[PDB]
């Protein structure tokens, strides 16, 4: 009865500048809970499916968040897989690639990483992982330079499909005849996924979206980049886990998850949705002036977004709220 448990997470965006406010305390708390969760469920590996950092130059406190989560995780014996997102810099994550290998951590920032055996906590082969980060076109086009022609939308899709195909074939070769689950990762936007504000466009001009049908028949596909946890293409085994904390206002109220993914005898057994404790209050106030005035006189100060369809002025609203909002147990970040 051989088991293999991984936790699936992504889109941390450590060092996000949220309307001039820090996400540190929230990320701190999340990483603490992630740490506790990893122990609670005797997890073998955590997979961070891209967008570790909000930018290619994370601030020190975000670099620190990252570094000592990895350190703290060592108490568990859980392996850590860190994949580059489109927000990450490859050079930034590779700064500590080799260092992280001494701390049981696989940092995969670029394309071209061969699949690998994921150990179980007793060091024995648990899964075969195709560690596929966000694929910069320049990296996978290294296959065949596609210039001076038409239909480049096609060329990229082919290159992504072919990439997964080559890696899946290699995973299968690596697995041999062992009853091992094959786990694939990725960082892109799939056909039909539901996005949020904080989800930047990628492959602008050459790939609208990636059809999930084009994914190899892995036992689980761990995706990131989309902040809302959803099943892709009707397939229980192809998933975005969502961001662990709300990265824009259109996501507050909604639940935050990491996926606990259990494998049994080489195959997927269950996907559990573990609720991430929300630790910073956010709310969106909608309507007219008097309505918005009537809303907030209810109520760690809650952050506020104030959406407004009342045509009067550009600046004048802002000053008006400034007046009505002051010295209330809140804090406002946006006005639209």
Domains of the chain: 1-279 (3.60.21.10), 280-336 (3.30.160.720)
Q: How many other C-beta atoms lie within 10 A of the C-beta of residue 123?
A: 8
Strands 125-130 vs 45-49: parallel, antiparallel or unpaired: unpaired
Structure tokens at 166: 């080559």
Alpha carbon 162 to its chain's center:
23
Using CA atoms, how far apart are residues 148 and 155, in angstroms rounded to an integer?
A: 12
Using CA atoms, how far apart are residues 281 and 333, in angstroms rounded to an integer?
A: 12
Q: Is 331 exposed, middle or buried (0-12, 13-18, 19+ CB in 10 A)?
A: middle
How does 97-111 read in b/e, with b if 16+ C-beta sit within 10 Å?
beebeeebbbbbbbb
The CB-side HSE value for 164 (13 A sphere, CA atoms) comes to 25
Question: Which of 85, 76, 62 lies closest to 105 in space, CA to CA?
Answer: 76
Residues 6 or more apart whose CB falls under 8 angstroms from that of 336 comprise 305, 306, 307, 308
DSSP 8-state secondary structure symbol assigned to residue 108: E
Structure tokens at 318: 């802002």
Using CA atoms, how far apart are residues 17 and 273, in angstroms rounded to an integer?
A: 27
Using CA atoms, how far apart are residues 228 and 199, in angstroms rounded to an integer?
A: 10
CB-CB contact of 108 with 83 (8 Å)? yes
Q: What is the resolution of this structure in A?
A: 2.5
Measured CA to CA in angstroms, residue 266 lies from 1, 38, 107, 175, 235 at distances of: 10, 21, 25, 10, 18
E strand intervals along 162-245: 182-187, 220-224, 230-232, 235-240
């Amino acid at each position: 009865i051989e088991f293999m448990r991984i936790l699936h997470t992504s889109d941390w965006h450590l060092g996000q500048n949220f309307y001039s406010k820090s996400r540190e305390a929230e990320h701190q708390a999340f990483l603490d809970w992630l740490l506790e969760t990893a122990q609670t469920h005797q997890v073998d590996a955590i997979i961070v499916a891209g967008d570790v950092f909000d930018t290619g130059s994370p601030p020190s406190y975000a670099r620190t968040l990252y570094n000592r989560f990895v350190v703290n995780l060592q108490q568990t014996g859980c392996h850590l897989v860190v994949l580059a997102g489109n927000h990450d810099s490859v050079a930034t994550l590779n700064e500590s690639r080799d260092i992280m290998a001494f701390l049981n951590t696989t940092v995969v920032a670029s394309a071209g990483h061969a699949p690998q055996i994921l150990p179980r906590r007793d060091g024995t082969p648990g899964a075969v992982l195709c560690p596929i980060p966000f694929l910069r076109p320049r990296d996978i086009i290294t296959s065949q330079a596609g210039l001076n022609g038409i239909e480049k939308q096609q060329h990229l899709l082919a290159a992504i499909t072919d990439y997964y195909q080559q890696h899946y074939a290699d995973a299968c070769k690596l697995r041999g005849d062992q009853p091992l689950p094959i786990i694939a990762t990725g960082h892109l936007t799939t056909v039909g996924a539901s996005k949020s504000d904080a989800v930047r466009d990628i492959y602008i001009g050459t790939l609208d979206a990636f059809p999930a049908q084009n994914f190899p028949p892995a036992d689980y596909i761990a995706l990131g980049h989309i902040h809302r946890a959803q099943i892709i293409g009707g397939m229980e085994h192809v998933r975005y886990c969502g961001s662990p904390i709300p990265l824009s206002f259109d996501e507050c109220g909604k639940s935050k998850y990491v996926h606990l993914v259990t494998f049994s005898n080489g195959k997927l057994e269950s996907v559990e949705n573990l609720n991430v404790p929300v630790t910073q209050p956010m709310a969106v106030l909608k309507g007219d002036l008097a309505s918005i005035t009537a809303q907030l006189e209810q109520w760690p100060p809650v952050w506020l977004d104030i959406e407004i369809t009342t045509d009067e002025y550009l600046h004048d609203i802002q000053r008006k709220i400034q007046a009505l909002t002051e010295s209330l147990p809140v804090e406002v970040l946006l006005v639209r």
